[PDB]
Amino acid sequence: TFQVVQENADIFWKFQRYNLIVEYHSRPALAPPFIIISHITQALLSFIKDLLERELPSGLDQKLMTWETVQKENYLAKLEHEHRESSGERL
Amino acid sequence: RLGDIDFTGVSRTRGKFVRVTSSTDPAEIYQILTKQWGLAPPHLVVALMGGDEVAQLKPWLRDTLRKGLVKAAQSTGAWILTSGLRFGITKNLGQAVRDHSLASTSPKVRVVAIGIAPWNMIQNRDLLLSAKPDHPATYPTEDLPYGAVYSLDCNHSHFILVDEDPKRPGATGEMRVKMLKHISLQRTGYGGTGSIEIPVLCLLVHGEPRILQKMYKNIQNSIPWLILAGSGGVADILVTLMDRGCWDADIVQELLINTFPDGLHSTEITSWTKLIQRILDHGHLLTVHDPEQDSELDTVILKALVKACKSQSQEAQDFLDELKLAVAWNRVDIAKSEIFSGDVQWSAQDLEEVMMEALVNDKPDFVRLFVDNG
Amino acid sequence: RILDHGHLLTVHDPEQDSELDTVILKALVKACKSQSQEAQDFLDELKLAVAWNRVDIAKSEIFSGDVQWSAQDLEEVMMEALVNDKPDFVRLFVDNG
């Protein structure tokens, strides 16, 4: 079971690590039992009033979309070229 | 008459322009391009001489041509001289140029699409007539039909708006020819130490018989021409004549009649026949690009340039610019097959500068070739 | 007199070709091409080629230089290729206007 599972376990660990880091993003920086100070501060701020999942300006967003399209075209061209130069296709 | 344009629409972009008359010296416009607008002297100039006809290229051939041109140009800093009007092959070529510019992670090498457009073809010219230096003129982008008036393409970075000459209705063509000739006599670098003569090259895409005089004038100015195999207009005539091997007056007249049934004028037909015969008389400045067969525009460009240079002379120093351009494109096979084939003697002093260029730019194949060649 | 026509005659060699659909499509497109050059005339042969996934035959015969193709002409055939799950013909029509 160890031999068969370890490789999938590593990928599952990375996938879970994403969610754990996302959770740690919004977690207050004060560990319990101190955390009550941060909770009171958050409640007071909510009553009175992210590095991940950011929103970009229109120009930069369009630039990144065009860059993604160019990279996709390059990737597809590379796949097609590797298909043409394959031994079976040449045969 | 200097101003800036702030295109408004799907994509907001800023573009410069300058109004100019057909009697001006092209040296002034080249100087303003190099200095006022900060454009570095190009390492390659590709001028489009078609695509304004009603019939347009198929999307597959259009995409193949734009991809080939952009891929060839992106190695160095190249200029693409087109009529800066949002229509036909020019619109999509400018779109491809801007797409490459946005996705270019290296801004040191820049592909610039210069627009030489007649002032009579501009839609909403009064909108840009303001051209306040402090506040750039606002211009709306509209995809007009064929008609006779077009809108300035937003994807073209710089524009050359030429006024129509009262003498003849060919001011824009004369300006294009003069500008190509003037650019062909410049140095690609800032200083004339490690700089080549700027390679000016023309591309023909479904030409009309009206542009035959301008094409022959350009050929007289000794600048190579590239002909698309499947363009459709005069380009088809030229590729068929190349496939024939020889040209006859009856043959060229028959092909011109078949390809352009609408134009039936005895004087015009005779003039076009003579122009085509004189164009084919050169030949070495003509080269056919078949995207269905080759699809490697850089290779064909290099072959045309080296063919023109070889026809010009046999001296090693003359071949130097073509060899340097081949170095800049990693075309070691083309260089070995054409430049370093028996005819041209090569001394170490001649090859020292090209060795420096190949060594600095990380071209191991050319380093091996030069070490093996003296 | 039969051989005088010729374009309506087509040879099927099962030892060589053994692809009857391809030969049928070739004969029909040959007859249509001999009949006329208009795009609307080629429409039925193009639709039949769509129905048989003969993208190679269509590209080699119908979409080869001679016949002009407008978007309005190709809209119905685009619909037919898109509904019937013919990705090759979708690619061909998108690439052809």
Sole residue written with tokens 């009171």: A40
CB-based contact A69 B12, cutoff 8 Å: no
Tell me if B201 sits within 8 A of B223, measured CB to CB: yes
B292: Cα separation from own chain's centroid: 21
- How do beta strands B44-48 and B112-118 pair? unpaired
Torsion angle, alpha carbons of B44, B46, B47, B49, to 10: 160
What residues have CB less than 8 Å from B40, skipping those under 6 apart? Answer: B34, B77, B110, B190
- Residue C81 CB neighbour total at 10 angstroms: 25
Q: Which two tokens stand for residue B283?
A: 């030949």
| Residue-wise DSSP of chain C | -HHHH-TT-----TTTT--HHHHHHHHHHHHHHHH---TTTTHHHHHHHHHTT-HHHHHHHTTSSSS---HHHHHHHHHHHHHTT-HHHHHHHHTT-
CB-based contact C97 B59, cutoff 8 Å: yes
Nearest CA in chain B to A70: B103
Q: Tell me, in Å, the resolution of the deposited structure.
A: 2.8
Tell me if B65 sits within 8 A of B291, measured CB to CB: yes
The helix (H) or strand (E) run that includes residue B242 is: helix B234-244
How far apart are the CA of B100 and the nearest CA of chain A, in angstroms? 8
The structure was resolved experimentally with: cryo-EM
Q: How far apart are CA B274 and CA B222, in angstroms?
A: 19
CB-based contact C94 B59, cutoff 8 Å: yes
Residue in B3, B37, B7 with CA at minimum distance from that of residue B123: B7
For residue B169, the 8-state DSSP code is S
Nearest CA in chain B to A63: B102
Q: Is B283 left (phi over 0), alpha (psi -120 to 50) or beta?
A: left
CB-based contact A62 B100, cutoff 8 Å: no
Residue ranges of alpha helices (H) inside B164-208 are: 171-183
Angle value at C-alpha B239, between B237 and B243, nearest 5 degrees: 115
How far apart are the CA of C93 and the nearest CA of chain B, in angstroms? 10
How far apart are the CA of A88 and the nearest CA of chain B, in angstroms? 21
- The number of C-beta contacts closer than 8 angstroms across B and C is 11
